[PDB]
Design an enzyme around this catalytic site. Structure first.
Site, PDB file in Angstrom:
ATOM      1  N   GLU A   1       0.826  -1.200   0.000  1.00 61.83           N
ATOM      2  CA  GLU A   1       0.000   0.000   0.000  1.00 61.83           C
ATOM      3  C   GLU A   1       0.862   1.252   0.000  1.00 61.83           C
ATOM      4  O   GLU A   1       0.571   2.219  -0.713  1.00 61.83           O
ATOM      5  CB  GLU A   1      -0.923  -0.015   1.216  1.00 61.83           C
ATOM      6  CG  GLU A   1      -1.528   1.330   1.560  1.00 61.83           C
ATOM      7  CD  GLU A   1      -1.575   1.573   3.055  1.00 61.83           C
ATOM      8  OE1 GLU A   1      -0.500   1.598   3.688  1.00 61.83           O
ATOM      9  OE2 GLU A   1      -2.688   1.729   3.598  1.00 61.83           O
ATOM     10  N   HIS A   2       1.941   1.242   0.782  1.00 61.47           N
ATOM     11  CA  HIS A   2       2.812   2.405   0.869  1.00 61.47           C
ATOM     12  C   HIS A   2       3.446   2.723  -0.477  1.00 61.47           C
ATOM     13  O   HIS A   2       3.506   3.889  -0.882  1.00 61.47           O
ATOM     14  CB  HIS A   2       3.892   2.169   1.923  1.00 61.47           C
ATOM     15  CG  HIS A   2       3.645   2.886   3.214  1.00 61.47           C
ATOM     16  ND1 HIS A   2       4.359   4.001   3.594  1.00 61.47           N
ATOM     17  CD2 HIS A   2       2.768   2.643   4.216  1.00 61.47           C
ATOM     18  CE1 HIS A   2       3.932   4.415   4.773  1.00 61.47           C
ATOM     19  NE2 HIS A   2       2.964   3.611   5.170  1.00 61.47           N
TER      20      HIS A   2
ATOM     21  N   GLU B   1       6.575   5.503  11.015  1.00 61.32           N
ATOM     22  CA  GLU B   1       5.134   5.557  11.220  1.00 61.32           C
ATOM     23  C   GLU B   1       4.689   4.602  12.317  1.00 61.32           C
ATOM     24  O   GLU B   1       3.720   4.890  13.016  1.00 61.32           O
ATOM     25  CB  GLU B   1       4.388   5.262   9.917  1.00 61.32           C
ATOM     26  CG  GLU B   1       4.437   6.393   8.896  1.00 61.32           C
ATOM     27  CD  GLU B   1       3.437   6.214   7.764  1.00 61.32           C
ATOM     28  OE1 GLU B   1       2.743   5.177   7.737  1.00 61.32           O
ATOM     29  OE2 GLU B   1       3.340   7.113   6.901  1.00 61.32           O
TER      30      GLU B   1
END
Lengths: 64, 446, 29, 418
Positions: free
Chosen positions: B60-61, B137
């Site tokens: 996804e990143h 993150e």
């Protein structure tokens, strides 16, 4: 909902009723491939010795 | 003078069509000039094993970080130049990439979505950069108490099951992940039968279907060497995980019981029950006069800064409960009141509060499905979970069937004398021991 | 990005709106 | 159906669009806010926003809360510096009850002493919650520094006035600022005649313009907080055009040219010129965007930056230099076109949702009276020329600037240095 089959030590669970046979993952397939590779290598060696026209005697199995 | 029933009847209907490869193309058409087109993929942490956990988050990143057809800057430049907003969200059960864009820009948006889903570069340098970003993150996400307590709830409730794994994954996996693992994850989980192309707004279903046939057709549902991932039911374990950190200002506690699956009919009465329990935050203006007894008592005694009730549903199991943030010395009282409300709904629910809960649920359903983005999200998630987008009229009928007897029945089945799963964070010393919590789940009077 | 400092509420939702104030990629960086 | 606009003789504006949707949203937009507060009654707007559930002449606090909750409705108060919006959302069948509650709240508040005294703590609770994000305090200080008058007033009550807001002050503010000429009743999913009937029923009284606030005057000051946060939030702005003017559209296009908000999640803001311009200089975690605030009297335009305390000066200087480069004429037609597309898409996406559409209709009704169709707004955006964007950049560079900074501020430049 038919009554389920209770596996025991003298009545093993059938592969058909194995809860894990229907939960397969890529790693499980990889492991099956590796096991097939091992068996194939062993069978190859055994058959090479077994079909040799020169061999006379027992094929000493290390496992035995 | 349209009535609520008439309005439900006039709602535009979702049309679902399937490409031969298995991609399902769904659309709801409105007069709006803006459309939201997105691809929902049935891939998530629950489909990931221990070593590859978090690969979905990595993919996804880096999905928007470049394609083979257009390099990393090119995709962003195209999206911004046409004014579109590109966003992705990954959950334990679903992964989605959606583009908010003008209706006239639907073809280009579909092209970009297909490129992102299929022809993802996964370049190694970008992989290292995203690795660093993801570690940072994770360190940031440690600060967000709500996310941490919910992750603890999942870990303790579904221990030993894939659902316990977090979407982001352990840091060790993040640093150990490689290009091969990400490529394998894409090959295994991103498959046409497990994907849904959904759109909302000014979208013609025929045009969307034709664009899908043009671009997504190559994607295939065949699994290499017939390595097919198999869904696994997840066991719910009643357990308690307490991270006692007295330095933290306020204590977060999340307590839940096993809930229905997505398709189980009992979700609607349970949502009505949770609406009866309600939600409260210190910033709410209603305060003491609020109908929810828990909210009223919390406001009167300032028991908790915030408390909310959640109904998280997965395919075969779900977490049903509430999350409340409170002072160190008010945890026991709030837990007592929450369990008292649970038992009151289980045993002696009344018609009036049931009507209030049904009305709240109706308003939430209608209000949430507003705008192209939420409508498209609902379409995709409904196709993935329910196999069908339940129309609002069907939701209204199911809500209307709910009565006090139904609420009592379902609440007794799911909430009464059931072992709960508790996660606590912060100064949680006053949080009752698990034996007391379990004892609270039943009433000696009843 | 106005980032209207909204407040969670039911039956009384105080929302106050300011003007575009960034805070766009701080999490990303 | 189509939006129907009616200017009643008392001056109230009634608008209705029958979307034939399950939910109906009714909003009363009143031309009151922090701007119309004087020094004596600062923060009264804040408590008024909080005091939406207090006992009214028509209904008690208990009745309002319980009834709105029972129908599953929501009552929301949205306040800007120039506007306050009271909205009720529920199913179309029960819209009448919430409409009665809304007009009771807006037109006949009691402001009983005990209830206001009880609610005064919610002032501090709300202020603390809002100030958790540094952006709120930075923008409050930015408005305070930029203007010496009405617009400088904070959207949140000052700390010294937390317990000092009096019921008489609330009554005075309502009587002098909640007036028919200042109000617009906007409805989605409600027929026009019904809204008209309710407006006659309750909003007949308190006619007239009411008290008028003074024109905002630019102050060109700086406020530096020194709160010790790791990252430094700094905003540098200069006076700009009022809302609904040609230069205002030029400034919006300029904001989109420089970079307003990322469109691709976890992206690099490639189109955003400020972002890349800063990024090449600074390799540390950073952020930058264009601050475009437009009010009826005047507006502010400038740059908002979030960066590491040590590197704040570099980021601010790089963004300022990029704006200077735009002002000097280094602006491509393609960039202008892309910004125009982004702005038009943003307007459409904003008006897509029911809340956004109601807010836009209310804002247009209050600011400009009539409702302008989205197509005409897009045409206004298209009409902006590149020369207008260059002139807007030149005005920002040349004009006197106001700055608000929060954080360590050890290396944050002062306005004179910039």
């Amino acid at each position: 909902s038919f009554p389920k089959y209770k596996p025991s030590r003298l009545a093993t669970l059938p592969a058909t009723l194995d809860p894990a046979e229907y939960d397969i993952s890529p790693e499980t397939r990889k492991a099956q491939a590796e096991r097939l590779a091992i068996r194939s290598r062993l069978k190859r060696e055994y058959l090479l010795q077994y079909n040799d026209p020169n061999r006379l005697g027992v094929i000493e199995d290390p496992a035995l | 003078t349209a009535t609520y029933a008439q309005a439900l009847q006039s709602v535009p209907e979702t049309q679902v069509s399937q490409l031969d490869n298995g991609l399902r193309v769904a659309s709801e058409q409105s007069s709006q000039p803006t459309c939201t087109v997105g691809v929902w993929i049935d891939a998530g942490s629950r489909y990931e094993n221990e070593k590859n956990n978090g690969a979905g988050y990595f993919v996804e990143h880096l999905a928007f970080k470049g394609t083979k057809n257009r390099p990393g800057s090119a995709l962003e430049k195209e999206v911004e130049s046409m004014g579109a907003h590109l966003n992705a969200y990954s959950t334990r059960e679903h992964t989605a990439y959606y583009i908010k864009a003008l209706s006239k820009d639907l073809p280009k948006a579909v092209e970009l979505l297909a490129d992102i889903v299929q022809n993802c570069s996964l370049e190694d340098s970008q992989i290292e950069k995203e690795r660093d970003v993801i570690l940072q993150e994770l360190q940031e996400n440690d600060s967000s108490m709500r996310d941490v307590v919910f992750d603890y709830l999942h870990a303790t409730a579904f221990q030993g099951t894939p659902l316990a794994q977090s979407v982001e994954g352990p840091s060790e996996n993040v640093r150990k992940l490689s290009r091969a693992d990400l490529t394998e994850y894409v090959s295994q989980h991103y498959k046409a039968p497990r994907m849904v192309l959904a759109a909302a707004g000014g979208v013609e279903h025929r045009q969307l279907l034709d664009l899908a046939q043009k671009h997504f057709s190559s994607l295939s549902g065949t699994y290499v060497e017939d390595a097919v991932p198999a869904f696994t039911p997840c066991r719910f374990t009643g357990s308690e995980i307490r991270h006692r950190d007295d330095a933290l200002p306020l204590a977060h506690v999340a307590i839940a019981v096993e809930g229905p699956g997505w398709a189980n009919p009992d979700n609607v009465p349970l949502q009505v029950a949770n609406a009866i329990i309600g939600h409260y935050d210190s910033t709410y203006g209603g305060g003491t006069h609020m109908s929810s007894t828990l909210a009223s008592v919390a406001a009167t005694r300032k028991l908790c800064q915030s408390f909310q009730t959640f109904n998280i549903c997965y395919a075969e199991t779900g977490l049903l409960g509430a999350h409340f943030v409170c002072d160190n010395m008010s945890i026991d009282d709030m837990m007592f009141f929450l369990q008292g409300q649970w038992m009151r709904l289980c045993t002696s629910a009344t018609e009036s509060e049931v009507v209030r809960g049904k009305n709240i649920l109706r308003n939430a359903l209608v209000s949430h499905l507003d705008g192209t983005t939420p409508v498209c999200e609902d379409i995709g998630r409904s196709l993935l979970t329910y196999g069908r987008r339940i129309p609002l009229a069907e939701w209204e009928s199911r809500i209307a069937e709910v009565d006090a007897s139904v609420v009592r029945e379902v609440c007794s089945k799911y909430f009464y004398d059931q072992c709960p799963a508790v996660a606590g964070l912060g100064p949680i010393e006053q949080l009752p021991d698990y034996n007391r919590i379990r004892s609270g789940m039943f009433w000696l009077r009843f | 990005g106005p980032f209207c400092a909204g407040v969670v509420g039911h039956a009384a939702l105080p929302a106050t709106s300011e003007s575009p104030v960034l805070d766009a990629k701080r999490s990303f960086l | 159906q189509d939006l129907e606009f009616t200017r009643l003789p008392n001056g109230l504006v009634i608008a209705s669009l029958e979307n034939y949707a399950p939910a109906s949203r009714i909003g009363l937009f009143i031309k009151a806010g922090s701007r119309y507060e004087d020094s004596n009654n600062l923060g009264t707007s804040h408590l008024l926003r909080l005091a939406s559930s207090l006992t009214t002449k028509g209904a008690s606090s208990f009745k309002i809360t319980r009834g709105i909750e029972a129908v599953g409705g929501k009552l929301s108060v949205t306040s800007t510096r120039e506007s306050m919006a009271y909205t009720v959302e529920c199913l179309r069948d029960d819209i009448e009850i919430l409409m009665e509650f809304l007009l009771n709240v807006t037109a006949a508040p009691e402001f009983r002493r005990w209830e206001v005294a009880a609610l005064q703590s919610q002032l501090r609770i709300d202020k603390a919650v809002a100030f958790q994000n540094p952006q709120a305090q930075v923008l409050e200080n930015l408005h305070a520094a930029a203007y010496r008058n009405a617009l400088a007033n904070s959207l949140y009550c000052p700390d010294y006035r937390i317990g000092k807001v009096t019921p008489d002050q609330l009554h005075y503010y309502v009587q002098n600022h909640f007036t028919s000429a200042r109000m617009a009743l906007i409805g989605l999913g409600v027929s026009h005649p019904v809204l008209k009937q309710v407006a006659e029923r309750f909003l007949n009284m308190r006619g007239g313009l009411g008290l008028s606030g003074a024109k905002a005057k630019y102050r060109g000051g700086e406020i530096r907080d020194q709160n010790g946060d790791s990252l430094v939030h700094a905003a540098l702005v200069a006076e700009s055009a009022a809302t609904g003017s040609a230069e205002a559209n030029a400034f919006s296009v300029l904001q989109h040219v420089l970079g307003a908000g990322p469109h691709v999640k976890r992206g690099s803001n490639a189109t955003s010129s400020l972002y890349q311009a800063v990024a090449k200089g600074v390799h540390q975690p950073f952020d930058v965007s264009a601050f475009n605030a437009s009010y009826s009297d005047s507006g502010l335009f400038g740059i908002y930056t979030i960066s590491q305390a040590a590197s704040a000066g570099d980021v601010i200087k790089s963004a300022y230099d990029q704006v200077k480069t735009i002002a000097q004429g280094n602006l491509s037609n393609t960039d202008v076109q892309a910004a125009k597309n982004k702005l038009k898409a943003g307007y459409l996406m904003s008006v897509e949702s029911s809340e956004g559409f109601l807010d836009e209709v209310g804002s247009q009704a209050l600011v400009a009276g009539s409702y302008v169709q989205p197509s005409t707004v897009l045409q206004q955006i298209d009409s902006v020329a590149d020369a207008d964007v260059i002139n807007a950049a030149k005005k920002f560079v040349s004009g006197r600037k106001s700055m608000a900074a929060s954080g360590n501020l050890g290396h944050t430049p002062f306005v004179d240095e910039l």
